[model samples]
Target: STGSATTTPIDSLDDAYITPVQIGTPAQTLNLDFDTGSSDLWVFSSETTASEVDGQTIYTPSKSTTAKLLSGATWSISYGDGSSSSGDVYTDTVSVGGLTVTGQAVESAKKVSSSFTEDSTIDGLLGLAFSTLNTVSPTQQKTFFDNAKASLDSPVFTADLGYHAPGTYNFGFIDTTAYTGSITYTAVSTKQGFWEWTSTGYAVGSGTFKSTSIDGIADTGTTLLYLPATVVSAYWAQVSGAKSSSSVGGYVFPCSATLPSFTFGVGSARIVIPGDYIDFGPISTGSSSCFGGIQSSAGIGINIFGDVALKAAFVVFNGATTPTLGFASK
Candidate 1:
């Protein structure tokens, strides 16, 4: 079968990109974040405590005749941002777009951290990262893409994220009309369970491109671009009135400060990030101080090219024998 699906983003608190999916026989629909940073198809479910669920939709597997418990199976996952979820496992039908996967592992969360419970807009997470990273015990689970790729026209997906606007996630095929200019491809190393790659170099403002290698992951779940300490310092250095603030968290600056442009290298092609994107948003309501979207990866180990970076281009997550990342201006 030649399969494909297009999903529109739901506005949230400048967080992850959310998509809709159908699970079980009767089709329990859940709005989930399409996270490439981790693997596991998990949802808030009936098994979860009523007080813990908040306003999110809960997936009731018992209502579906096709749902079957995996018995002793269990799953617990912790994200980079410290949000966590855990629960039992069930095998059921899971569908995205026009593609369906039979007997896919659907982890039902009985518990979730405040980071998730507070965001009632997202009911679950649809992991697009490599399945090897799945956290289910007894047996590892395959993601919806991994289980349905054989029927796809091409084992691929595209993320088109917009700034303060609606965006889309397309599966199985690429719409050439969505982007402009030639696509520049870069080899991705998935050994770390992420779309990890080495950016040749980067530059701040109209400054010369510095050859400092930055290794990072392309994470749709994260909201900002995280880079090396030295790189973050260099970028903020050009923004007058910018300084780190413990009260506000990260680096905060006067909202009217002239922010510099940032650019990263992918092979010989450079994808530039406008100064407006770097301003992120105000520290809080009615606050004149804004947080810098480009921050330090100091304790986070590797850098992250999150929505702030990904939205600047049309990204292709190629699931070929040798996975690669294709980028082009939107």
Candidate 2:
């Protein structure tokens, strides 16, 4: 079996990628952020705090005849950004594109923090991370990708995230036509429940390549590229009127600054991010300062190669027993 779906960027900055998912017997459709960094397919539900249920779509397990509550299952999850959700579990039929998984554990939220908002069309998040990271208690659950992998033709899924345009996520088969050049494969560390890997190094614009290894997760859920402070500082130093600021948080620069592009290595291959992507939209209206796509990961402990980096390549999250990540420079 195979699944194919289009992932659309939520906004101009490529803040998040959302894909359509159908849950329940009758198939209640909800648009979900496909996050490879976190595990747990959670949604706003009839059980969520009444005040927390805004206009965003909610999954009503009660409405689905096929839905069944897991007797002792309960869960809570928190992301790096401080957003959180906690609740009980329900097993229901879930589908992504043409792929179907019956008796899939769907976490139904009873409480959620303000970070999971109605500010946009995002209803919930569909985690593609390793099942070891799932938050469900007593009985942990597998992600949609995990449950679908065994039946998939190739036991893999590819993420072709675009800067401003829509990208595609295909399960079971890799669409060679979606990417350019040969895909360079690298080993993945799943112990952390992340699609983690070490990059060969990085370069600032046309400068010399730093032959240092930087280890991080490839997170499609996050918006920017976060690296060691030294790396971030060097990139901004190359930009005119750029500084690490408190006003807009992280690194910010003048709107008119001539931004330098960034390049990171995967083995002998290098993927380049256009300078324009570094000019993340301005922090405030009428303000000359703009938030930078590349920021310091000092506080986060681990670096994150988020959408800012993923948008530059075609990524493959292979689910082989011995998994490996694939990157294609398109």
Candidate 3:
């Protein structure tokens, strides 16, 4: 699928925020990050200290007049990037795209900056991905998607990331008509915090690849695809004369020739990464050469399919039917 070329900065542990829509009898806009990896619709507020909040898009809940703070409750979040933040719990009426969602739970950072919130462009993140984390909250009520579904034109939320082109993570409905055929889907194995899988093997430089028992996680927020030590080493081996730069975290290769294709096996589904994607872009440090889509993060714990790898397909976050994703071609 053709992808969008867009990059945004967020303010949080993980540089992400939920798309905002205007809500209320009057109108107060709430900016947040759409995150399904964890279940929580949080926002930055006036109560936060300027020091803790660096480049964050501060949301003045008091400006809305319909907001309230939970006072005593607090939360702390740690992302795959190994960064984290904490804050006090608060509830408020959040508005977006002319919609009003009351009793929306938000977290005002008691401390930020060490996480994604440092990015000026991204004000906050919306958790649109799935997690058995918390679908129903009697006290907090429903998630942004769950509460806002009725007001939406379709009971679905479409993530058109083509412009920013990181990855497309949609919720509600995913029609495979945009893809080549019926498409294949893999069931999610619930575990710890992330929706993870054991990658049977990976294909790089268009050759035969066998199952290499490596576990990984699917995350829409990450910009790069991270692999296990062995997978990264084996894949880059095929990129002729490819070498790891002394100053860079990943392997860099010359982009003068036509590169081979690569694929990652997840159950029966073959997730392919085109060669052009591997070429990344030009780096000032090395030969005008580019990069391989795969990066080696030996200590990154589980392998991860970040935004670069995720943008290859049209994804649907199907919380109605199953806690899984539906893939299609745009």
Q: Which candidate is the best by lDDT?
A: 2
Flag regions of model 1 displaced more than 4 Å.
1-13
lDDT of 3 by residue, 1-330 (tens): 111112232321222423554433255454455554655555565766676666556666666566676665666666666765566665676654434567766666656655555554545555544434542332433566666565554455444343233433333345445455544555555565455556667777557777776666666666677887777787777767788876765787876756666787755567676766566655654556766667886777667776556556655544444345444444
**What TM-score against the true fold does each predicted structure earn?**
0.95, 0.98, 0.75
Off by over 4 Å in 3: 1-18, 21-33, 52-56, 94-101, 114-117, 129-160, 163-169, 198-200, 209-214, 255-259, 282-292, 320-322
The total number of steric clashes, by the backbone 3 Å criterion, in model 3 comes to 39
lDDT per residue (tens digit) for residues 1-330 in model 2: 998889998877777888999999899999999999999999989898988877789999999999999999999999998889999999999998899999899999999888786545788899999999999999899999998888999989999998898998889998999888999999999989999999999999999999899999999888889999999988989988888887667888888888889999999899999999877778887878888999999989999999999999999998899999999998
Ranking by TM-score: 2, 1, 3
Residue pairs in candidate 1 whose N, alpha carbon or C atoms collide under 3 angstroms? none
Tell me the alpha-carbon RMSD of every candidate: 1.6, 1.0, 5.4
Better of 1 and 2 by TM-score: 2
By summed lDDT, which 10 consecutive residues of candidate 2 come out lowest? 114-123
Query: How much is the lDDT of residue 91 in candidate 1?
Result: 94
Candidate whose TM-score is highest? 2
Higher lDDT: candidate 1 or 2? 2
| lDDT for each residue of candidate 1 in 1-330, tens digit (9 for 90 to 100) | 444444445553355566788898889889888888888999999998787888999899989999999999999999888889999999999888767889899999999999788888889998989999999998899988889888788989888887766677887888899999888999999998999988989999999999867889998888899999889899998988898887776988898888888999988888899888777667888888988999988999889999889988899999999999998887
In model 1, what is the error at residue 68, expressed in angstroms?
1.3
Clash count list over all predictions: 0, 0, 39
Task: Evaluate all candidate structures by whole-model CA lDDT and list the values in order.
Answer: 0.87, 0.91, 0.57
